[PDB]
From a paper:
The [name] domain comprises 100–130 amine acids and is often present in chromatin-associated proteins. Our structures revealed that the overall fold of the [name] domain consists of three motifs: a canonical β-barrel core, an insertion motif between the second and third β-strands and a C-terminal α-helix bundle. The canonical β-barrel core harbors an aromatic cage constructed by three aromatic residues, which is a signature feature of the Tudor domain “Royal family”. Taken together, similar to other members in the ‘Royal family’, [name] domain also exhibits methyllysine histone binding ability.
Residue numbers in the entry: 9 to 111, 124 to 151
Write the structure that this text describes.
Amino acid sequence: EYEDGRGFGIGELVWGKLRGFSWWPGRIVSWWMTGRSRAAEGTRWVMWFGDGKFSVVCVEKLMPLSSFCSAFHQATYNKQPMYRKAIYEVLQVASSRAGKLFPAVEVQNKPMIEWALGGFQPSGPKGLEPP
């Protein structure tokens, strides 16, 4: 599965872009997790954080989580509680992988967002990879 040389393999935390919606946090899953069928070449199944919906997304509309500064939209964050939830979730998962520890969603998000914005120090983007 996904051996087409386009990257974004299973378990990778990503930003995904559908028409009519902001870049949204998700993770790449296998097709059998979706309760659907195989994705076409050059596309991936992503499970969105926030509500856990599944979508087929072309790799051209995917960015790694590390592209946080380009994808993160402050206006969306302010107005959409599910976006704050999605940010919370993807960064909880990311920080667990990187071994980045932090000392209700809006509160806990701030150090995690700062971490993301600062280049995911000390691990960098490498710490965000599936174990």
